[PDB]
Symmetry: C3
């Protein structure tokens, strides 16, 4: 890849937003590469989870404003946004639809599209040095990157509306209180903690994960009876899968099902 950092180890496909000089804003090319990378992860039997993080001390500053053409008129501007907006779309959608759990490791500021990415991921943790901001209004653009889908689904309509309208910066503590992030860790221990959490996610049963993830997205909008129908189909498939019997055996042999799949350290 030439615009993103990418590495697969320990069952984790790690995608790094890398444009640190410009606060990890996402270029059109980079977005194409993240999506490709998400496609490849889903196709890799050796990948159990995906982790998205930023290079250095920023997560992602959102739209790459420095690539917008300024010498071609409104047209040039409209044209650029049609293309970049399509890639923000492709990528955000892939994060939500990919058949792998995605951990957003928020190591610094997440603005605009950056916040969009954080909201689209399955799990999210951040460094105590991280921060979140809508930023759309500041730059005079209508909000996107599925913020009309994700934000309210996580924080409720009221907080979603306030954050977008006030445009204020949300800090770790509050982000955690809001459900935006599950846990916060000292900056210095952040990377290590996050990689370990990703390895666990990767080691846990992908099949079950995917069933949970797809159902969560779909179920939000379905009535109970349709929900159960789809869940039951998953149940039947899961107990037919070779993974099951051995777990039952263990349970019957005294091993408790409250054993965690992923251990999230307390953090701060």
């Amino acid at each position: 890849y030439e615009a993103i950092g990418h590495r697969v180890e320990d069952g984790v496909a790690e995608i790094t937003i890398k444009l640190p000089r410009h606060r990890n804003a996402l270029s059109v090319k980079a977005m194409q590469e993240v999506t490709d990378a998400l496609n490849r992860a889903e196709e890799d039997d050796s990948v159990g989870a995906v982790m998205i993080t930023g290079a250095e001390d920023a997560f992602c500053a959102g739209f790459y404003l420095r690539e917008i053409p300024l010498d071609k008129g409104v047209a040039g501007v409209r044209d650029h946004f049609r293309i970049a907006a399509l890639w923000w779309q492709q990528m955000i959608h892939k994060i939500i639809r990919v058949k792998r759990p995605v951990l957003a490791a928020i190591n610094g500021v997440a603005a605009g599209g950056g916040l969009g990415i954080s909201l689209a991921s399955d799990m999210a943790i951040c460094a105590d040095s991280a921060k979140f901001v809508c930023a759309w209004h500041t730059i005079g653009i209508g909000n996107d990157t599925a913020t009309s889908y994700s934000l309210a689904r996580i924080v409720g309509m009221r907080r979603a509306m306030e954050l977008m309208l006030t445009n204020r910066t949300l800090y770790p503590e509050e982000a955690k209180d809001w459900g935006l992030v599950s846990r916060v860790y000292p900056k210095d221990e952040f990377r290590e903690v996050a990689w370990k959490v990703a390895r666990e996610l990767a080691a846990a049963p992908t099949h079950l994960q995917v069933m949970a993830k797809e159902r969560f997205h779909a179920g939000w909008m379905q009535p109970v009876e349709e929900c159960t129908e789809f869940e039951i189909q998953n149940v039947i498939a899961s107990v037919t899968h070779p993974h099951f019997m051995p777990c039952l055996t263990r349970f019957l042999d005294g091993h408790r099902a409250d054993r965690p799949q992923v251990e999230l350290p307390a953090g701060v």
Copy 2:
């Protein structure tokens, strides 16, 4: 009488006790059949104003009764049992959500898998300080169910729903309360009585009004504002037409419904 569950009717409350204490109150097929019947019966009963679901002893419900799974019939034997069992979990969960009575979940201890499902499907939930919640699905190796794909996010939001399930983390009362999973937490020793009082109060409150609110809440989550108001309006109209209305008004003109103690 029932053979796999505890069941009492007192002070307008139909108390359903999940009773398989030696096995942590896991729900057997038979039991689920009984629970559902009990729910139907309560709704058919003019004397019943509310339903209470609770577990026997110190456990709420450990979920799927795994000791009921046949091991001498191969994979198909397993599969066939789940089809039946899952159908029953389904009939029960749906009923809790659709029954025309308020349903109080009195979480007296551990709620795992289907036990958590029950907790989430209920109208109101309170737990003892000794209770805890765990998905279990991802460790026991079974795809999630018991409408967790419906109720969990509606309660705690998508992020927390996904986290809980994925990590298989155990949620203790203080966080469960902060999350909204339970409304109040009470000391283990005072628990049953607090719960009984709350239930008696719900039973006493106007059933028709409760049903209207219950049904609307479920439906409205998914409807546009204009459709929600048409349904609410129909409810208002019917309500001011009901005998209960006038007396309330005059009393108002002339000069809480359920008291949830603060707990811990």
Copy 3:
């Protein structure tokens, strides 16, 4: 003009004041029509940037105006009345949610039944430490309405929505804030002023952008991500096309940075 509500347009804010303080600011049929009218007018006024709904005195709104219900005409009379007033509660509530302007609910005191509905239908909500919230329906013997089956769970989650309704408990500011029912709480004596500045800040902010966000938030709650992004993109494209865009971009590149949020909500208590 208006004879049943307080109203003004100043500093870009259309301020609607619920005014029936002897009666705790309950809403009469006539005031409801006026509130709806004023919302319509705000939306058509180039001079208005935001709307603020507040109560006169020490109450926000006690809901349905009970003293309007005909006791002399039996059942059909009572019902006929409810038919009309419910319609107006409805037209009003709908408008708050659909109006093309950000609406701030400045809850200066008690919000009961329909008053609670108004506060839930608004886009932003802040309250005085002296305020309180209560469903009240279950007590007066009426089915819940005013879009509570829409707004409440969207805000506080389904469990807390259910709870509040069923217990008919009174929610105080600290808890309402914890729940997300209100964003901030301010000392009673400071309230009016804080709220008025928040409204002015909301009005000064770019309405076009505000509207886009508001419409997508309501719509998107019920739509799949692919459908959400398509509508979002339509707004992105219209927004960078609009004259306001370029100046913001240039400034960013130039090194200009905002000294504060578009809308500042002071910490409060």
